[PDB]
């Protein structure tokens, strides 16, 4: 069903999505470091940093992003970082435990259960759609290229980048889940759950600010 131009678009997206590496140096710390609330928090700081790093790298290569107004580019990057990040951490969580040690660190890092619980529900809610890489990539791109973010000046230029991505996803849903015609709608339904992390994340940041220190990049991406 994909047209030549849809294929071309899908390949660019996949090329860029696959260059995203969680560095070994960081995954190594998940086992190699001692556990305490402090060490765990440092590790998470570093992971969050890498997620945002990788988001920027992915974003800048999305077709048409470089043609956007430079202020709108920044608004999209800040607007989408939480959702993009939670989505990526789902993918990493579900594709060795390993996963187990990471889970343990998250659950001991000065984060209240009020936020941990939904985080892990979400990882489960994502994992039973059994999403392919293509689906993760396109969703991430759809999240990033949202015309509904605060401060955007030219919302139409964003919507024109986003819409084609949504078409490609709809067809992919029909090719990889031909027996479930509600799949596309389920993927989009998980986006509304993903959005609830904007509020949770701001609250986690607010309670961490009890003498705790953040990297430069996390300071800029979230204004803190």
């Amino acid at each position: 069903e994909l047209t030549p131009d849809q294929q071309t678009l899908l390949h660019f997206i996949m090329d860029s999505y696959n260059k995203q590496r969680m560095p070994q140096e960081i995954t190594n710390k998940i086992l190699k470091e001692a556990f305490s609330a402090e060490e765990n928090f440092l590790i998470l700081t570093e992971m969050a940093t890498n997620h945002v790093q990788v988001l920027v790298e992915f974003t800048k290569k999305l077709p048409g992003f470089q043609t956007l107004d430079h202020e709108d580019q920044i608004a999209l990057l800040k607007g989408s970082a939480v959702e993009a990040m939670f989505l990526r951490s789902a993918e990493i969580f579900n594709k060795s435990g390993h996963s187990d040690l990471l889970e343990e660190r998250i659950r001991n890092s000065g984060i209240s259960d009020e936020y941990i619980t939904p985080m892990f529900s979400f990882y489960k809610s994502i994992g039973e759609l059994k999403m392919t890489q293509e689906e993760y990539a396109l969703l991430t791109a759809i999240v990033i290229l949202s015309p509904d973010r605060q401060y955007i000046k030219d919302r139409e230029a964003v919507e024109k980048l986003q819409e084609p991505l949504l078409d490609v996803l709809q067809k992919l849903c029909k090719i990889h889940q031909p027996e479930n015609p509600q799949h596309f709608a389920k993927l989009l339904g998980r986006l509304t759950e993903l959005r609830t992390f904007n509020h949770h994340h701001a609250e986690m940041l607010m309670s961490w600010r009890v003498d705790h220190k953040f990297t430069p990049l996390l300071q800029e991406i979230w204004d803190v």
Partner: peptide, 11 residues
Amino acid sequence: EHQLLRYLLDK
């Protein structure tokens, strides 16, 4: 917003 992000986008 800011310099670090603009740098990371431009490089």
